[PDB]
């Protein structure tokens, strides 16, 4: 159901975790998002919040920003939504 | 006046049929079904009556309206 990295990220406040710690984001995608400018987890969190938690818009932006596919975007969106539900 | 078919009345009708447990949406469905069937009987009864130049829908007209649709009714004949 849920990856272990997802559980580790959702368990505790993100604080200063690097963007590569996000569920569904590997080294390549993390590097790409850093190159675009998004170098921290909370930056992606804020970008998610700006889109008012819309699943389709978040996944489409992620896809157009680094080339993530359905599974990676789904995992990242689920992790971020659960983090918001647990801390936000 | 279709709400005149009271929910306990439909419950009793089901009890006669051998039903044991009744859902909740059933009541509106039964009212709809009863409305349709009553329309389809009274239409033919009224047509028979309009034919004979009467203003009273006698019993034989209702018996014939049923007899057309295959549900022969005994006891009112007539």
């Amino acid at each position: 159901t849920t990856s272990q990295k997802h559980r580790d990220f959702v368990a505790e406040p993100m604080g200063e975790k690097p963007v590569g710690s996000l569920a569904g984001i590997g080294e390549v995608l993390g590097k790409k998002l850093e190159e675009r400018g998004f170098d921290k987890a909370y930056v992606v969190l804020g970008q998610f919040l700006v889109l008012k938690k819309d699943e389709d818009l978040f996944r489409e932006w992620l896809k157009d920003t680094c080339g993530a596919n359905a599974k990676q975007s789904r995992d990242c969106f689920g992790c971020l939504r659960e983090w918001c539900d647990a801390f936000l | 006046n279709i709400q005149g078919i009271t929910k306990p009345a439909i419950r009793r009708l089901a009890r006669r049929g051998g039903v044991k447990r009744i859902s909740g949406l059933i009541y509106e469905e039964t009212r709809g079904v009863l409305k349709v069937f009553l329309e389809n009987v009274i239409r033919d009864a009224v047509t028979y009556t309009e034919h004979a130049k009467r203003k009273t829908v006698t019993a034989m007209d209702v018996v014939y309206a049923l007899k057309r649709q295959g549900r022969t009714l005994y006891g009112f004949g007539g």
Binding site: - | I5, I22, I42, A45, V46, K55, A59
Partner: protein
């Protein structure tokens, strides 16, 4: 207090109603329903009393048969409670 588990009162009612034969719809609500439905085809119709009696007997028998078939459908699907989908299937198979 003393209170039956649900299901037994249903069986007592089942036997009581399958033993007797009186009408199961109160007469006056049904009479007003019949007049309301006929009011759209002819305006000044007066029903003989026995005509309304026959209409009511036919409606009760039709509904009892319908609930018999619906109960067969419901028991078919490993349930005990009928549902609108059961009635819709019974009417669909019957030819309506």
């Amino acid at each position: 207090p003393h209170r039956y588990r649900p299901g037994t009162v249903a069986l007592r009612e089942i036997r009581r109603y399958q033993k007797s034969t009186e009408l199961l719809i109160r007469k006056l609500p049904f009479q007003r329903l019949v007049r309301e439905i006929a009011q759209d085809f002819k305006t000044d119709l007066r029903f003989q009393s026995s005509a309304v009696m026959a209409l009511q007997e036919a409606c009760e028998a039709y509904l009892v048969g319908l609930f018999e078939d619906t109960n067969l459908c419901a028991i078919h699907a490993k349930r005990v409670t009928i549902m609108p989908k059961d009635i819709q299937l019974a009417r669909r198979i019957r030819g309506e």
